[PDB]
Paper text:
The majority of botulinum neurotoxin (BoNT) serotypes require recognition of both the protein and the ganglioside receptor to gain entry in to the cell.
Here, we show that the cell binding domain of BoNT A3 binds three monosaccharides of GD1a receptor. Six residues of the protein interact with this receptor through several key hydrogen bonding interactions.
Author numbering: 871 to 1221, 1229 to 1266, 1272 to 1291
The structure:
Amino acid sequence: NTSILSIVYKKDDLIDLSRYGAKINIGDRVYYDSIDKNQIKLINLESSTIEVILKNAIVYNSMYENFSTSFWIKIPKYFSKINLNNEYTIINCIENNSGWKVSLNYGEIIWTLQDNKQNIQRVVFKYSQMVNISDYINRWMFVTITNNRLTKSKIYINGRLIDQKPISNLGNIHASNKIMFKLDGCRDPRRYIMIKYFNLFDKELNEKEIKDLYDSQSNPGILKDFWGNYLQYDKPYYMLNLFDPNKYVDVNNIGIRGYMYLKGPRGSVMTTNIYLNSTLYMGTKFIIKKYASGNEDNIVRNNDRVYINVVVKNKEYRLATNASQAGVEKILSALEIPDVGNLSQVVVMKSNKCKMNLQDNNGNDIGFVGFHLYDNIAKLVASNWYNRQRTFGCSWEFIPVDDGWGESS
Ligand SMILES: CC(=O)N[C@H]1[C@H](O[C@@H]2[C@H](O)[C@@H](O)[C@H](O[C@H]3[C@H](O)[C@@H](O)[C@H](O)O[C@@H]3CO)O[C@@H]2CO)O[C@H](CO)[C@H](O)[C@@H]1O[C@@H]1O[C@H](CO)[C@H](O)[C@H](O[C@]2(C(=O)O)C[C@H](O)[C@@H](NC(C)=O)[C@H]([C@H](O)[C@H](O)CO)O2)[C@H]1O
């Protein structure tokens, strides 16, 4: 552990777990998420600040010493022309025109190094808002920036190297003893970010260190929604099939003689010059219902035994099948909840992206929920074929409505 700053939530506050015990000053307008307290929200106000004061012994002052930062960030969709050409600082460690900072702009994360003769290098991660389905817009990203003073500054996103710039021509970098987390210079009063697990390291992290940090901070026994938030019970979700992302779930008819299937194409949402995406708030909603989960919270965990409700014309039905139908593929139906009887409905949730393993009432696997083409109709099925087998039809995302995406529901 070469971490010299590691910030985490404790008791309505933030603490440094490092042996260097940074002082952390939090403003009056900083917010912790209700479900995951480590998710910090900063808004576009002067009091929405976190100031981290490093011990003098670890302040960065060197031409030669290698160093890295890591953090998680969730950046809501840019929906206004005032967001074009508005670079704003979010993480400042600049003192007397030397140091480092993280800034944002439309579709960008920017790393800046500035030496004590005001030579700069910027490394920029650009993501497009003109894409069908974005890996990045309003989705948690794991950011890692590494700096080797002889070679390159590198940006990783979700543990993968995205780009790099040579930095060997920079001289002495003397950063601040203060790290200010604050939206600085943002003209849009509605901009916010969410951030967690800010770390500093006194080396250039290697690819394995970065992959292990990614995995270790990911809460791997908790299932995630599309946005990367914790998956929850009693929260309506629009479904995305990762094999066929340009389709959405629909119900042909309710009852044991009906079926669910993937219908295409998705519509689009756009604002000229700002974004052009596939519509996410489409199709049959799924609601994850408590079965074997405990009373302690609404978080869906790996191996939780659940029921799945499906919403059809503002009424809830139960996802179920008759496992005794001929063939490995068990066509799924939307049943009246009272009328399920002895039909298979228990689902084991698995966290890989989200999988749903349908069970019979004896505790035996019926198989992962996916789809099967019956001529041109992609019917939802449970099939032990999936279980026996990178991207299959049994891989799903759950998309709840979110403030940061802004499409009409
Ligand atoms: C290709 C296929 O049909 N796979 C079936 C599998 O079929 C067996 C053989 O492999 C077939 O070649 C053979 O076809 C016969 C026809 O039935 C007959 O009418 C024709 O005239 O002659 C052929 C005889 O050679 O049939 C045999 C057995 O009958 O059988 C298994 C179960 O044993 C599955 O049904 C399998 O289809 C797969 O089913 C799963 C769910 O169980 C799933 O739907 C798979 O579909 C995806 C996926 O969800 O991951 C999604 C895509 O639709 C699919 N691509 C296609 C079909 O274009 C992909 C890929 O197939 C690949 O698996 C991953 O990319 O998978 C589905 O393939």
